[PDB]
Amino acid sequence: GEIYTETLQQTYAWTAGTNIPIKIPRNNFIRKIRVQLIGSISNSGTAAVTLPSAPFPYNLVQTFNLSYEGSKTLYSVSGTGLGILMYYTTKGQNPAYPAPGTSVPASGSVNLNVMWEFDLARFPATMVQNIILSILTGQAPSGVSINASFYITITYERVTAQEILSEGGLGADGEMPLATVLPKVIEIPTFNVPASSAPIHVAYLQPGQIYKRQLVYVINSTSGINNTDPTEYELKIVRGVPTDKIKVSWAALQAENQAEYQVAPYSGASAIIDFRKYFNGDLDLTHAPSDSIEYDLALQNQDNVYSLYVSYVLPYYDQLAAL
């Protein structure tokens, strides 16, 4: 149907360590939600303050949680992970002011403008209840104060009953359209991954979803996300005859991202795995067994690993299989 965008009148002030539940209006089907943290950062001290390195300013939001009907989760990601995903998907153009390392003059301030977007495919919002975007804010960088608010912008699509019938109608339970694709973007951490020259097991991909791409970044206790500890990435099938599906160096992966996203790496410790580039289409594990596919890393130092999965699920997967 007709696609249009509008910005909610109600804004939400940024305060440290605060969980901000935002109700999303169900005016029509929703294709996406945009969040912009806009305002300023001030320094009332006597010396100029150098703002922190990456993942600032994205870590000014600790976590984003998008859910409906109380228990159904569309997104569960940190402000950092979603921000890095924005960096790549926007060819590094995503608004992220001020840049890491920016200086805030004594008795001065700098402009703040950070953006994040949630792709909801074409969510049948008019058919569900209580869509809530929860923003758990992060902490203020040392030596400064944050003076800003979150602006919410929604992209809708007016989907008529006629279009729905034309696209197969509703699914068996009559809850949503048959052709519904539900995003399932979840960030999963893995702490204390030991240094290794050969890739070691980080985690298994859970079945029940279709994997499109995986964003992986690593944190070093000294240099944070600005490190070059990862050297190799491996996606291996462990169930049955052990078989690697992906075995690449971090540099080669980042080179692939460069071509794909037309932008240099967010840092030496971040990379994206577009599964369709290694499988015929996306990695569909809807009915796959558990603990069958793992992703492994070779790290120069023992670090904490973060994996943000850009996946989706078909609520009526089976029915659609008919064709």
DSSP state letters, 77-130: EEHHHHHHHHHHHTTT-S-EESPTT-EE-TTEEEEEEEEEEEEEEEE-GGGSS-
Q: Is 15 exposed, middle or buried (0-12, 13-18, 19+ CB in 10 A)?
A: exposed
Strand partners, 22: 133
Q: Write the DSSP symbol of residue 24.
A: E
Quick one: which of 73, 66, 75, 34 has its CA closest to 186?
75
Distance CA 215, CA 48 (A): 35
Q: Sign (positive/negative) of CA torsion 130, 136, 266, 36?
A: positive
For 28, the token pair is 């029509």
Find out whether 34 and 117 touch, Cβ atoms under 8 Å. yes
Quick one: which of 62, 61, 55, 48 has its CA closest to 110?
48
Q: Which helix (H) or strand (E) holds 162?
A: helix 161-166
Q: CB 301: neighbour CB atoms within 10 A?
A: 16
For 272, the token pair is 């994206």
Rg of the chain over all Cα atoms, to the nearest angstrom: 21
Residue type at position 48: A
Tell me the three state secondary structure of residue 134. Answer: strand
Q: Are strands 293-299 and 230-237 parallel, antiparallel or unpaired?
A: antiparallel
For 148, the token pair is 């800003």
Distance CA 64, CA 20 (A): 10
Resolution in A: 2.0
Distance CA 219, CA 238 (A): 26
Find out whether 27 and 3 touch, Cβ atoms under 8 Å. no
Method: X-ray
Distance CA 177, CA 29 (A): 11
